[PDB]
Design a protein around this nucleic acid. Structure first.
Lengths: 426, 79
RNA sequence: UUGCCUCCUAAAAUGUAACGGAGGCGCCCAAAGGUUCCCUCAACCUGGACGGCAAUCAGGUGUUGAGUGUAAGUGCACAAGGGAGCUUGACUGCGAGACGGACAUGUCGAGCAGGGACGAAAGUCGGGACUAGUGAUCCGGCACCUCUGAGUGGAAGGGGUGUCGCUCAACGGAUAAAAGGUACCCCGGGGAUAACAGGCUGAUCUUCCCCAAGAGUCCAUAUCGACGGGAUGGUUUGGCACCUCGAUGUCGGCUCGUCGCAUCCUGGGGCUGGAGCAGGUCCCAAGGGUUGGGCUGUUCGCCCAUUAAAGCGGCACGCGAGCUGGGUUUAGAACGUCGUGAGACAGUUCGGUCUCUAUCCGCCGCGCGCGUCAGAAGCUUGAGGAAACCUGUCCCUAGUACGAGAGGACCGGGACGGACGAACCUCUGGUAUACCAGUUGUCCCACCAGGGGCACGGCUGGAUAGCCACGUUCGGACAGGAUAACCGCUGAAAGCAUCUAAGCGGGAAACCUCUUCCAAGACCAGGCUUCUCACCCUCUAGGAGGGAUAAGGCCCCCCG
RNA sequence: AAUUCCUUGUCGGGUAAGUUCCGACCUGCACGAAUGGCGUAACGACUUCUCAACUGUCUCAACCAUAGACUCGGCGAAAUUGCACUACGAGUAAAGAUGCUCGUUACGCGCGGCAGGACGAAAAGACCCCGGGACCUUCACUACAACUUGGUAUUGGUGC
RNA sequence: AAAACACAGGUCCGUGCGAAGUCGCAAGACGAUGUAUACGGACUGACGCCUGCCCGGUGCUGGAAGGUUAAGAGGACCCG
RNA sequence: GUCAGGUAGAGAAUACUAAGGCGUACGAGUGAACUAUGGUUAAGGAACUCGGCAAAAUGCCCCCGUAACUUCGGGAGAAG
RNA sequence: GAGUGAGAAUGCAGGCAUGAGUAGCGAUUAGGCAAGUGAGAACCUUGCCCGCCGAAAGACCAAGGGUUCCUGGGCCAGGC
RNA sequence: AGCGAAAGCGAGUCUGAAUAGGGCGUAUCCACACAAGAGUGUGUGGUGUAGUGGUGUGUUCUGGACCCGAAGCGGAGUGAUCUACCCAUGGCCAGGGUGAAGCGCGGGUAAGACCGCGUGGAGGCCCGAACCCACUUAGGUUGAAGACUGAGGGGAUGAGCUGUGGGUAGGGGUGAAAGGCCAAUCAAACUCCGUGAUAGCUGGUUCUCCCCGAAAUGCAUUUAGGUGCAGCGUCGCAUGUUUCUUGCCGGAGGUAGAGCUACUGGAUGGCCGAUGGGCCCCACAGGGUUACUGACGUCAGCCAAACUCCGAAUGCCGGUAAGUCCAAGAGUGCGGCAGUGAGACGGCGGGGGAUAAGCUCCGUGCGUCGAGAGGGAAACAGCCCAGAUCGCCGGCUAAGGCCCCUAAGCGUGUGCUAAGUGGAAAAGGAUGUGCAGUCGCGAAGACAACCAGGAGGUUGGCUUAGAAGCAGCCACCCUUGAAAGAGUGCGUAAUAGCUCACUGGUCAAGUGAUUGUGCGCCGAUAAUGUAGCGGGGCUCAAGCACACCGCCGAAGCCGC
């Protein structure tokens, strides 16, 4: 990918759904995304439009005022709060004579610049190749000044000229072959991703997947609960790959905490099909931890966006994760006084600051009931000579305290079914 | 989409023309320069274009006054 | 972009290109010129009413960092830098010498006279500190002339001196006066110059590798390997234009293949987060195979079924003197867009002649002559090649090992199969142009009956042979040896250890045999046997030239 | 959409599969009402698809008769030709070698066939470019035709 | 060989009669031995529902009160 | 341009034939490959293919019956 | 004093080579036999069979060609 | 007899106020003098002035202008027998189907409308011959045919086809319009004529010998493949070392290099560090802690084509001395005559590029080819040696070679090589050897090995499911100093085992790490067939490094 000069940006949108408050929230979200990507928001405006214009996405008068304001502000970058077409952007650029992009372009740029591993780097690269695929003919610069780019001649018999297919068709063929190879690669690495956790889910153990829109967890909850410090940030879309740890109850059974990358509303429908890591992880997860901010202007918007994405993937993959418990964190920030408004209709709203915080005792005590569904529930009496009667009765996972007796000891705890099925004797 | 440069000026033939220990006639253009990079010594005058030209026959020599390099024309002293 | 000026590029004289790097000019000054004289800034401290830190004035500290009308460079503090008085040399006639120089241009000039200016009185001034601020020639304007005046006198007109008229800016300025289309195209040229391919480089691309931050429920290396770095191949996009424009026919498809392994399966190994089954990686391994269709010309790709697979690539993006022409890529036509329009689309849609008797090599067979040391024949070895090499399902082993269980083996055998190839016609089936039969029309055999010629053998139902596949039989091996990956034994160098340095070994569809075929033109021209093995004339005996000859072969003849 | 580059727009039909096709939604790059807009019965050697039968188009090809081809006899050309008792691999070369270097292979001469090459034959490349043309277009220049206005001779006379 | 052309049906423009248009330097001719229900030119192309707005620019038609404008009447001044 | 027979045929098409005219001008063999023309083909019937290109199939006369649509004519020889 | 020197201009005219004794010998009718002329016969003649056309490959005209029509002689040229 | 434009003058004249500067002639020279020597002038007396007409040669002017070659322009005419349309007059369209108006009957409705009933045989009607076209397909595609045939195909009573005879004729015709056709050609026909059109373009240009011998550069160009001039070549005329090389001497440079406290810029870390913010008392009085920021300074260390306090080597200009001096066949000036004005590669400094390209543009008294043979390079223009007058059956040599091809050595000695490296190659790793130094131990037998050594409170640590030497943890001042540590790593979840920082008796030299000295390994890896020494072969060197001996080696030198 290619990164150019930033920090001089304008924002254009059309408010065709929701209310003025929602349009403003979308504008603010775009502003925050641009800020994180490394831009300085100068002016962002929304037009009350039923549907975007098929020429400039804004309209003639809107484009005029945008030209005026951008010329006065000395910026050269425009950002549309949506998914514009090559036709839209061609006019939107011819009207201003400065670079133009949209929110999906911004998100692909930030993903590309935040990518950590070759895996995600290739995923994001494929996303941007497939977004730029339509602009072969749509690339007016590629298909302009091209008089005589090929052999515009014919004849009966010997021609000797070998553009047997239109130059544009050859370009389409080559880019299609490149994209096919990349798709084959991203499908191939499915097996690599699988074998990486192959050991996991073989020895069945509860898996709690931490889900949340972007800027919700940013691995902060992971670092706070498990105790393992990983890349945690207040910026957006910082955790680019998942990570599991050992955190659990006092019980020896591990509760593998599955990290999840953020999910921004209104995805560009290019990563939801490429970045399969988190999707597969939530598919195979046993419990779900839904992260929410208690000081946001509309937490319910993100809540339902996440719920919708989850339901879509669930119906797509033929699964059903019943356990779905939410948690309204970011209350220690004290930046939201709608705490009563949230609590009057949303239980399990424990409080943790944006980056730090505590008070997850109630969280854990309420979450355990949904994962501590073991079937052991077997007691036994070990005889005088314990000897080797310590292997899986004490040196195991979910092992509990018990009483003591002269004839060895009455172990009133629970022994795992697969580990110790019948080895014990009452 | 081009280059903004590509043109210069015909290089005027600057540079000292007659060197030390060289017989010179009266009026010969000793040195052509732009700044007074060679102040006019004795029997040598500075023209309009800051150039050095002899005034009397003889041979050219290069000398230095206080913080300046100049040219002089020593006579011939014919036998 | 086209002229001119400045620096670098530019390689310490000059000069020096690039569609190389940064900029300026097509001026402004009647004072910003000439001369006489005077003075020295930029910055800093001590004081403020502003006056900011900083507007003015003093003391200084301060030696060129300010400023030089205009870009930059060269110079200027001795001043070209700042201030002031007078003045107009911002002259006339010239001007030895010159620099630069294709030519035309351009630039400097001591010094003489006239009449000046400034200075005390020598002295300086023929514009601007220099380098750009401009345009030749022709043809005409304007003023002066002590030039000429088509017989004379004049006058007109001509001549000269001074000077004016061009973004002639494509700026050495072909006209005083000039824009486009050609896919209707034509002609002379070019591989000096493109599209296709070939060639060079490998930016781009493909396959990796190099230390490893982190991921991988702990753990960097079981598996990924970020940031960065080093390469291989030249199959993509590419860059150069080196052969080809007195033609190298261009994509896909079809036929045919040959080759590399960077291996899709099949075959051998190590690690695995390999309990078993399942699998995942990396090493060796190119012998064989690697499906059939819908879509679109499509290569690709998606989808439906399978199987082990439906591998990637080169060979002019293999193959058009082998084929089709789907669209590419002519002439027709229309839609949307651009052009006022001819026309264009680097958009879409319909339709649009695909030539050639194989000379040489090349390849598949076929022969004739000669050779393999008397002339022949029979049977063969085999130097060397060629052909082929695929594999699935199920039963037992064994519900056995393993695994609490779910599930479920390895190695072994046994049967049946998919594709491919060879052979054959006994079976099935196809074909059958003199077979048999039924039959339509017509004409003929005098005529009825019975027959024949023609009509695709007239048509129709059969049809032996031959040929053939849809049919039948068979092959893919078992076995030996040396190895690749890998696995071990004795063992010092290095009293130990070590798969290695000397050795011994196991080790795969790879390799050589084993299978089939060709094969002594295998010039090392082969081996074992059998057949007549004998004779005459000429040059003048030295080897030859003829003669009929032996076995045998051939010719012709009946033939397959 | 003969109009849509994105684009195989999205949904529903057709097949097991539909970048072609039909019905819809419409975000019409770049529909549009006499350069006519939307339908339209019949018609079309126009284009696109779908269905029944049909069949060697195909799985997958086989056999048979003719003109051929081939043998024989007769008559008897041509396009092409610098040459010749014209091999292959690796190369090197004007970068693709029968003709050059190293090696491998090959008895002399033909017959029938296959078409990889001899950058094979034919057409001094229609393509691209340079120069010359040609034809056509126009708010390129300069002219003319044609049309158009006035003066002027034909053309003269009485009044205000 | 077609979707292109033509086509019957439409609309507009011009033509008042040796009409316009066309051939022709001209004569003359076709137009037409016709006469606006005709002829010529332009576009569209049976038939049904219809052709929405705009005369800004260029064309076409027609104009009065004005401005520019060649040829000729003109005969001041100057000069030879 | 004029004659236009006989049979079946609706027919000047088609098949064979009347009179008439020709075997027309390189031939003889030969089951090579392969090409043109035909012919035939098991089982499936377009799976080849760009595309049913070609090839194949119905085809004639008489009876019934004949759709949406339609300008009321047609579609239509529908189809069966 | 020269029309003064060829090896080339895809040069020009004449004669010749290889390709080569190869292709080809001009359709969807087809010939055969006996005899004869002849020295020489597949193609000539006669006889006898078979086949082809028979809204013609028959018959008669126009234009077109112009002596080809027939009799008698010839086979150097032409009939592939 | 020349000067100016001219009048006009005259060896002077023009410019000119100028008897003063210049331009032009007084052919040219000799001697004399006078000022000067600023480049010499002025004069005086003598020599005195060479052009023109034929003629050849070489060029150039106008004519065709060395020859061939277009497309096309214009004048005059020929074409409508093909084809387009039209006009006059004839002809043709087999056969089978459909039923419109029209006409009379009835039901019908006051009456109409309509419904049928029979005749009717039209319609740019239907099927389909002749006929006219050419939609598909196969053939043909040096054909039978310069446009056809076999099969199918459309119309086939009309806008029909066709005969006969006429008209429309080239900037014109005609055109159901396709840039169609107009006699096999039509984006402007055909034949003659201008005409031998023109070509900045292609091709060709014929006998010999001798001498000399280029450039592909600069400038300008409606110019970039052309052309003028310049340079370079050649012949003549004159100068005759003035050329060139070397030495010495006098010179300016600002490049390479180098520096930044010497200017301008970028920037590596420290020192005091105000200047501002925090909090500061929230008073703006008022005191500074200050991870903040701390200028300018300062310590050290850098970098730059458009920075230079400095600054070379070459190069260059000049003076001088020699050298070559039977010749470099030098330089300079003037003519006769061109080509040249597409360069390429190699070394060097560069630009563009990715500091890639056999890439492109540059400078290089640098080279070669170009224009150049010979030997080495495998063949190979740009590489190395070397510039071919000819012959020789002579020799010595350069580069390169010396096992066979292939001429010369399987040379002599000292070492390395294990990889066939040699006889491709990177980042990286690495107990190979060749060889330098160096470490505490240390010929006490060092060290290894055999060795008695198996929980010290040793189940502590954080803790109690045990923390069971021992999951792991932050410490080992721990010894009759024996060779063991709250025992760490091999293992035990728990014991249990034994190594590890470590050992007495056996008593027999190594033990780590550098230079890695040069050589080695891999890394290493495309497709027709060894294919990365020419091959065979080579380590019993025929490989590598160093010494010495020789020999072959060309068209070079020498000998005749």
């Amino acid at each position: 990918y290619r990164q150019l000069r930033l920090e001089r940006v304008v924002l254009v949108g059309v408010w065709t759904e929701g209310s003025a408050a929602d349009a403003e929230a979308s504008l603010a979200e775009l502003a925050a995304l641009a800020e994180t990507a490394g831009s300085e928001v100068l002016e962002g405006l929304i037009q009350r439009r039923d549907k975007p214009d098929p020429s400039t996405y804004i309209g003639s008068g809107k484009a005029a005022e945008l030209r005026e304001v951008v010329l006065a502000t000395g910026a050269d970058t425009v950002i549309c709060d949506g998914e514009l077409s090559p036709a839209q952007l061609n006019a939107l650029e011819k009207a201003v004579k400065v670079k133009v992009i949209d929110r999906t372009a911004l998100i692909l740029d930030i993903f590309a610049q935040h990518a950590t591993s070759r895996e995600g780097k290739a995923q994001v690269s494929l996303a941007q190749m497939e977004y730029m695929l339509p602009r072969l003919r749509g690339w007016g610069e590629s298909m302009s000044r091209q008089a005589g780019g090929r052999a515009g001649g014919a004849g009966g018999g010997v021609g000797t000229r070998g553009p047997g297919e239109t130059k544009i068709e050859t370009d389409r063929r080559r880019i299609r072959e490149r994209m096919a190879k990349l798709r084959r690669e991203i499908r191939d690495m499915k097996k690599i991703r699988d074998t990486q956790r192959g050991s996991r889910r073989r020895s069945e153990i509860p898996s709690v997947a931490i889900v949340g829109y972007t800027n919700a967890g940013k691995s902060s909850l992971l670092n706070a609960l498990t105790g393992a410090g990983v890349l945690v940030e207040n910026a957006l879309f910082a955790t680019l790959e998942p990570t599991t740890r050992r955190g659990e109850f006092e019980d020896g059974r591990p509760f593998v905490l599955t990290d999840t990358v953020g999910f921004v509303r209104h995805l560009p429908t290019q990563l939801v099909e490429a970045f399969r890591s988190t999707l597969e992880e939530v598919v195979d997860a046993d419990l779900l931890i839904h992260v929410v901010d208690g000081s946001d202007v509309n937490p319910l918007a993100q809540i339902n966006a996440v719920r919708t994405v989850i339901n879509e993937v669930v119906a797509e993959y033929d699964i059903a994760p019943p356990p779905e418990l939410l948690v309204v964190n970011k209350i220690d920030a004290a930046t939201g006084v709608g705490l009563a408004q949230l609590r009057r209709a949303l239980p399990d709203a424990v409080f943790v600051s944006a980056r730090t915080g505590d008070g997850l005792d109630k969280l854990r005590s309420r979450m355990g009931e949904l994962v501590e569904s073991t079937d052991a529930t077997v007691d036994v009496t070990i005889p005088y000579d314990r000897g080797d009667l310590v292997a899986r009765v004490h040196t195991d996972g979910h092992v509990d305290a018990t009483e003591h007796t002269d004839a060895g000891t009455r172990i009133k705890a629970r022994v795992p079914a697969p580990l110790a099925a019948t080895l014990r004797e009452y | 989409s081009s280059s903004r440069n590509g043109r210069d000026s015909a290089a005027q033939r600057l540079g000292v023309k007659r060197f030390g220990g060289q017989v010179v006639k009266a009026g010969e253009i000793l040195v052509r320069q732009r700044g007074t990079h060679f102040h006019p010594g004795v029997n040598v005058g500075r023209g309009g274009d800051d150039t050095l030209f002899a005034l009397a026959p003889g041979a050219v020599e290069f000398g230095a006054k206080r913080g300046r390099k100049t040219v002089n024309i020593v006579p011939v002293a014919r036998p």
